[PDB]
Amino acid sequence: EPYPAWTADSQSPVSIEQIEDIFIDLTNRLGFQRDSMRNMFDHFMVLLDSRSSRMSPDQALLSLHADYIGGDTANYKKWYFAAQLDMDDEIGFRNMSLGKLSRKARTLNKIEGDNSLEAADFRWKAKMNQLSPLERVRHIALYLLCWGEANQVRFTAECLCFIYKCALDYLDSPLCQQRQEPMPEGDFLNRVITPIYHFIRNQVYEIVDGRFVKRERDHNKIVGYDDLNQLFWYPEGIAKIVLEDGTKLIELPLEERYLRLGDVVWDDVFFKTYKETRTWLHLVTNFNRIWVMHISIFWMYFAYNSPTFYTHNYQQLVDNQPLAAYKWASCALGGTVASLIQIVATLCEWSFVPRKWAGAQHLSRRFWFLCIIFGINLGPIIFVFAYDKDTVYSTAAHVVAAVMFFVAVATIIFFSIMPLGGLFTSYMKKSTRRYVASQTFTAAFAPLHGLDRWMSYLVWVTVFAAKYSESYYFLVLSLRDPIRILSTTAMRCTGEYWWGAVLCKVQPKIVLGLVIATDFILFFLDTYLWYIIVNTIFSVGKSFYLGISILTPWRNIFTRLPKRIYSKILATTDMEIKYKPKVLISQVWNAIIISMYREHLLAIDHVQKLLYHQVPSEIEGKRTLRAPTFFVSQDDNNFETEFFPRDSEAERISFFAQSLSTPIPEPLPVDNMPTFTVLTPHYAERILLSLREIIREDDQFSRVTLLEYLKQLHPVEWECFVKDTKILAAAPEYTLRTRIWASLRSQTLYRTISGFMNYSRAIKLLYRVENPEIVQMFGGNAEGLERELEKMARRKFKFLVSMQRLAKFKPHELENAEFLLRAYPDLQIAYLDEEPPLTEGEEPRIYSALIDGHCEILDNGRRRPKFRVQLSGNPILGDGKSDNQNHALIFYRGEYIQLIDANQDNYLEECLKIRSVLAEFEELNVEQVNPYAPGLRYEEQTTNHPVAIVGAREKLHYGHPDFINATFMTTRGGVSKAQKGLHLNEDIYAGMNAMLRGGRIKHCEYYQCGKGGAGMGEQMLSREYYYLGTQLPVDRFLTFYYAHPGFHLNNLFIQLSLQMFMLTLVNLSSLAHESIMCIYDRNKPKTDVLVPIGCYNFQPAVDWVRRYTLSIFIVFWIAFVPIVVQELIERGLWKATQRFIPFSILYSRFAGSAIYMGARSMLMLLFGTVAHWQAPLLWFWASLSSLIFAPFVFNPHQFAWEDFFLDYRDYIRWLSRGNNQYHAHRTNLIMAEIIPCAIYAAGCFIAFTFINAQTGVKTTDDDRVNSVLRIIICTLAPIAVNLGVLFFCMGMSCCSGPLFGMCCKKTGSVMAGIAHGVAVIVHIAFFIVMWVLESFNFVRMLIGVVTCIQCQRLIFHCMTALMLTAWTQPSRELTAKVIELSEFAADFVLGHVILICQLPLIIIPKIDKFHSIMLFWLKPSRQIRPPIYSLKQTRLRKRMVKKYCSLYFLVLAIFAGCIIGPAVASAKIHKHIGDSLDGVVHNLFQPIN
């Protein structure tokens, strides 16, 4: 009998014949497809069989009905309440105030409470209780039949619920029960499903010239897979269903809408329900709690510790004191800024969502309430700070100031704790929606019970307390001193004579905002650092207090393995005692050891040593089975050192033994364990290899060849294989054996199948060991004991493999698949199939078939499919894997599914704990109660939030799935989301959608699965992030944010910090160099004089530079140590130090992406170093150098003279080639690249202007500089001079006369070379011109060239932006050519500078190449892969490399002369230059005296 748990017992309420008749009757009445009815019947029977094993047959049907249709876990009940009784707001109110109602927990009367949902719940429970088993079977069968035929609307669960409700209503009508004509076969599929699929396909594709091609449109106008659900969520969207006549569907009676449903046009119904076109609006709206806290507290601190801002008439020695009202008003202004942040967030949210779909009447009220809060927070402070008190006042300023300060603190706390979506929902209560999103689906979070709630509270309170205290202390003091010093003093300079000397006066005030901004960024970094530290210490403390100490030697664990293994893996307490506890353990351990040795993973001396040593195995069984030297240890722990090593991945097994130490739930008898299935996709992967791959060498001369890899680098593996394979012997049998063995060591599907087919072996072993009756019942009949065990193995385990294509696979991969089916008969394969059309030219019909290793061979050599279900069309509209799993999901069995990849592997060691793993779903050892009892209420229910995902952990509140609840997840839509443009991850989206609807995610600890930035950052902005962010409570929101997006924001903040610091350093060093400074000490009272008269006291700014360097260094260290710790293994770092051309592509990629900023950073750092020396700049030097030169030390094959010269030749040729090659997102990138360049150039220009103000010297008027036009000349004239030569060449080529090129045989190459050469020459010439334009100073030249570079970059970006947004084409050509030649000059200079920097290194290793050997050693520490040289003719190569080396030295000499000549020219020239020049351009050269 196929299902013994239901038909053997006579206590079943119904028999198989009634169920079969019900299925047949439903198929006849509703016109279902005949081939799917049998599949669904088998599915339902397997469901009942699996569920009834641990329960009575009467309870299984009730539990299934509760889980599928009428229970409180079901989705149909949620949809019915939310979309037909209109009680979403009541559910929302119940969810938020569950503590108050639960605190009291430890038929004309129903009309009075009709509006309340408690009466509705009571009525529903009574109606469900009144049923009988036949109607329960009828409901479940109808739902399953409806589900198993819809193919792609299975992704939308609420459409399926609506269809099911309409079908049931029609079926119960007394009109279907009087008809005599059965409906034609396949009517449901076509008439109901096909138009929705047509809508979905036509939304994305388009038919042209007989095929289908994709459309060119933005995502903001397409509708797919979510707008359908959202329309079906609310009762106001169902009223939009329109018939073809213009009427509406809901006007018809309830028992007639199953035909006009097929007559519905879906074009005028669905619409877009969530528009996403931005990046910072989403960020601002989603996380408006972090910024409220941070900005508000920073403003409070900074406004309290800056008394000089509101001080009137400050004096350096008098130090007049203000009143306290001003400080209090400042803090209340901080409260006001928090309120303003909230208003901005709600405006962005209004921009977020569509116009008038269930979320329009809530945001205006919130806007008005926030406006009122802003007004009451702002008004009285405006009064106080507008100073009705300063003239005359009664003693009321202090009290009003204190009142407003406390009101501000209250506002900060309130707006920083409460969620945005649920602020003022307890005040409307009257007519319209009080929420923006559906509270039944989008916001249903499982409450946290027990000690975890308090642990999370404590962790977050500790983090925030420590952060606030430390940041206050440090930043407040270290900025309290510079703030006063820098805001007190002002300079005395001459300046420039087109607008005066205002910039020189206000420079020290300019140097303050940069410091403040840098401190802001440091605030953010500090909070992240404190989070990491506190979480780590809490985790280590919890691990310490758990009660398991790591100081015990593992030999005590090894000798305690017997009792624990017997208790946890083998013995179930409910069996009667028949054997001593010392035999079953021996059996299982010998089985696992011999299975380990079956793969030849160990030597011959250790296999017998590790065994239980049963030499007299066939006498009595007690005199033998004595413990070996491994299970029992000697008196000393580390006493065995002869054969106790078990190296070569035989120990690390020992992981299993270690994992046995953690607590493990009690097991269950094999007869009671539920059935499950294993699912895996396969598209174009590889199966067992052929002879060509296993007999052919690689392209290189024995370098990184897999064949030689497995032949040589198997020191014991290959020897063990050969010593046992050469005793077994065209040779077809030896041919196949080599194919099998070679496949098991490489990446193949056969390896995965062999690894995962251990479940049946483990189950058979457990079944034989556990039950001792059958073995003695047979008593010698091997056939019976193998047949019964095989039947038991087949009952409780299924394997499914999804092959997308098999009709067009391969002439030989088909034979491979046939061999696969022959090797393992139980394996099942699902594939797509096509049947030729029987009508005029139309789209081919598509099917779906399943075959196994038990169908006979057909006429054409194929196999007879068991089930063939017709699909509505081509299923693959996405990425494959998602749709590949979707089209084969209907062939699964059991209660649980395990999702695996195509390259995983499993060991028999980890397949003995499947029952323990499956027990983590908290449904195995649970007593059952009637779910429709009239007594209990919703609050007093323990089954409300089922666990959906259980993934073995090798988290972040959202883990990747390993095991999945089939019943929970398939009823809510798919096992993996399907969308090419929105849902790219099958692991995170599924977890967040499971959490949103009310499921629980767990993580195992004794199970290990077999496994080895911005691009997703901009795509992560979605609707799921919005729903999670605007609705979660504070602790859950914090723990979610600081894991997934907190990391990506922390990575971004550091770069902005570095750029701000570089600008600040440039301005500060200019200020300090230009002006004299003052003597300073440590304990000087503030009231005495400064010993040089007229000095400026500026040391605290330099001390600030020191402090910032220290802070950024420690932040980087704490953020970068874990990667090194993870990466460096080296046998545990020697037990943790005994317990305490290649140039071309890398240059392109890395040089661009990093050096294009590193070069400017290094230039600015060099100027700051050479203008005013400081100590921590030495540490700042060693970072950019490494970040630029890292690829050139990670790359071998760059350490030989001949190799270097060949690389140089390739460098020149590829330089030409790469210059040629490099020669809805446009405007946004244009803006985001234009603005920061303008700000950066403005800062550089201000610094450059100040350094020329010649402060500190006393002169008359008309004695200033005029650099404001020298900068413009030096940045603009090179553009014109580069345009001139290109214009000459282009004009000659456009003339294109009979003579074009007087001396050159070819014109294009020579003219391109001439233009490039003159461009680079004139650029270096104008750099020297800028040097000589001043009085031969170095630092002024440096700042001038930096400013010129920044200005040129800005104008290039602006010109490209203006050009991108019939002379239009030639103008674009000219502009592109100009940009190309500028970038060519820059890249030429950068590459040659890198080459000069590399020059001193090559002479060092010489022929000895000791450095090369060191590089080889370090590479071998990572990965060793070397080849052998080949000797051929070398005369031409030698000549070529000699000539190119001469060219390289010539270029070096030219560079050295160009950089050296100005030095001696300065050393010999006289002081006066351009004294005769006069007028508005007066002293263009810098006046030196």
Swiss-Prot record:
The organism that produces this protein has a lineage beginning with:
Eukaryota, Fungi, Dikarya, Ascomycota, Saccharomycotina
The record places the following residue ranges in the Cytoplasmic compartment, namely 1-289, 349-366, 420-456, 535-1108, 1171-1174, 1251-1270, 1334-1341
Q: How does it assemble?
A: Component of the 1,3-beta-glucan synthase (GS) complex, composed of two alternate catalytic subunits FKS1 or GSC2, and a regulatory subunit RHO1. Interacts with RHO1, which is a GTP-binding protein.
Primary location: mitochondrion
Q: What is the effect of changing residue 689 to R?
A: In A6; temperature-sensitive mutant; lower beta-glucan content of cells
Function, in words:
Alternate catalytic subunit of the 1,3-beta-glucan synthase (GS) complex. Synthesizes 1,3-beta-glucan, a major structural component of the yeast cell wall. Involved in cell wall synthesis, maintenance and remodeling.
Q: Which gene encodes it?
A: FKS1
Changing residue 731 to G has the effect of: In 1114; temperature-sensitive mutant; lower beta-glucan content of cells
Please identify the protein, giving its name as recorded. 1,3-beta-glucan synthase component FKS1
Cite the ranges annotated as topological domain Extracellular: 311-327, 388-398, 478-513, 1292-1312, 1365-1446
Q: Which organism is it from?
A: Saccharomyces cerevisiae (strain ATCC 204508 / S288c)
